[PDB]
Chains A and B, each alone.
With several copies, the nearest count.
Chain A
Amino acid sequence: EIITLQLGQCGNQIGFEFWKQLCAEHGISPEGIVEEFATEGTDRKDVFFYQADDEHYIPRAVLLDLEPRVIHSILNSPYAKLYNPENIYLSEHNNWASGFSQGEKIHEDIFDIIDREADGSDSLEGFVLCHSIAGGTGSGLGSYLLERLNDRYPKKLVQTYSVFPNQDEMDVVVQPYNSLLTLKRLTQNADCVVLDNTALNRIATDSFSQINQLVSTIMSASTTTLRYPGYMNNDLIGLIASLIFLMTGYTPLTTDQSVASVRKTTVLDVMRRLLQPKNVMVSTNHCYIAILNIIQGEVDPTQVHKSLQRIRERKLANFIPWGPIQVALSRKSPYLPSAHRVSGLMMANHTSISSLFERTCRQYDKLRKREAFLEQFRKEDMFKDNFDEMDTSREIVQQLIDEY
């Protein structure tokens, strides 16, 4: 089992479309009813859903937000009735310090909800977090929740889908501070999926609805095998151990109109495609640390071995000199059309990601020398006296970059 903590407008939407994808996959009706064709289903549902006496299924989700508008719109959707009104929380009434201050203020009810959800699962495995690191809501609230959660639950995993601000595009003027602080908290508490609007929209090209549909696709494909038990990799901890910051790529990212080219898609061509920097959805002979490829559809392990052999000989990849990939196979949901003969998802750890922080650090250093937009931060208690928090966070990020 698992819980999802989605914050800010970004996280709220991310959750909306993630649950849309899930209910589509598992044959869950918008109202929580189960379709007749899926009555005898074999798919495991406990992982993301828990059924109710009324036979309906409820997501293990909690909605958090500093503002009402987004969730109010969500509850006007056809999927509104599905969620649990008890879990959803809205502030009665764009800065990280303010977000953390509110988090300190509203500890009690949030952790009440979290405890209630936790006690309903026998074998909870970890946590899932969806949020954006730039905006005031996501950054600060995620920081506070991560801190108090790692404190509260020292034996549960914490996984996040953190969305990083666009850089080529000059959105949050105060983004460097929030990003740097959120990164501090991620290193200091997060167990383990980086995301950026820049490269994501780049691949989308070459509305937020479609972008986050792709993101939800990534999340669902990541959790597929856990959802669909097989032989190997039957747990999230198995995933994490096989890799341990990450980046992702998915081959069949094709529009509903781009099915006309039914290209004979082997496993070799897919696994190859997952390697190119173009497909890496995120934007010094930098090299890899780990690679995992989850493959959906018919697959012959002989083909997998041949592809691995050929790629190894062709040396299209580079590895650490000081240490000695993985190809897991799953089964598609029996419901969604198998427009793709075989499909592939890749999650990897690669040193080049360091550059991200070097940019943000460069951004942050490009402001701290002139004290820009610190007036609001001084208002909050945390930065009321000084900003030693900022210095510690910057040095922590520098240490991480040095370690990479």
Chain B
Amino acid sequence: FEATINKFDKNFSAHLLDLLARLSIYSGMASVISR
């Protein structure tokens, strides 16, 4: 348990930096980053 919580952090934070990445490349869809 003490060793798997830190795994989720490295796993979940990796997907979030992917969501904020693709949501930036656009011409709304740009105001989501400010949310």
**Chains A and B share a contact (CB less than 8 Å):** yes
Interface residues of A (CB under 8 A from B): 305, 308-309
Give, as a whole number of angstroms, the nearest-CB distance from B16 to chain A: 10
What residues of A have a CB within 8 angstroms of the CB of B34 in the complex? Answer: 305, 308-309
Between A and B, 5 residue pairs with Cβ closer than 8 Å are A305-B31, A305-B34, A305-B35, A308-B34, A309-B34
- Closest B residue by C-beta to A309: B34
Closest 5 CB pairs of A and B: A309-B34, A305-B34, A305-B31, A308-B34, A305-B35
On chain B, the number of residues with a Cβ less than 8 Å from chain A's Cβ atoms is: 3
Interface residues of B (CB under 8 A from A): 31, 34-35
What residues of B have a CB within 8 angstroms of the CB of A305 in the complex? Answer: 31, 34-35
What residues of B have a CB within 8 angstroms of the CB of A308 in the complex? Answer: 34
Docked complex Cα distance between A305 and B33 (Å): 11
Docked complex Cα distance between A308 and B31 (Å): 12
Docked complex Cα distance between A305 and B34 (Å): 7
What residues of A have a CB within 8 angstroms of the CB of B35 in the complex? Answer: 305
Give, as a whole number of angstroms, the nearest-CB distance from B10 to chain A: 16
Give, as a whole number of angstroms, the nearest-CB distance from B29 to chain A: 13
Docked complex Cα distance between A308 and B35 (Å): 9
Docked complex Cα distance between A308 and B34 (Å): 8
What residues of A have a CB within 8 angstroms of the CB of B31 in the complex? Answer: 305
Docked complex Cα distance between A20 and B31 (Å): 42
Docked complex Cα distance between A309 and B31 (Å): 10
Docked complex Cα distance between A309 and B30 (Å): 13
Give, as a whole number of angstroms, the nearest-CB distance from A180 to chain B: 35
What residues of B have a CB within 8 angstroms of the CB of A309 in the complex? Answer: 34
Give, as a whole number of angstroms, the nearest-CB distance from A133 to chain B: 37
- Closest A residue by C-beta to B35: A305
Docked complex Cα distance between A305 and B35 (Å): 8
Docked complex Cα distance between A309 and B35 (Å): 9
Docked complex Cα distance between A192 and B8 (Å): 29
Docked complex Cα distance between A36 and B35 (Å): 43
Docked complex Cα distance between A330 and B34 (Å): 21
- Closest A residue by C-beta to B31: A305
Docked complex Cα distance between A229 and B35 (Å): 23
Docked complex Cα distance between A83 and B20 (Å): 47
Give, as a whole number of angstroms, the nearest-CB distance from B23 to chain A: 15
Give, as a whole number of angstroms, the nearest-CB distance from A308 to chain B: 7
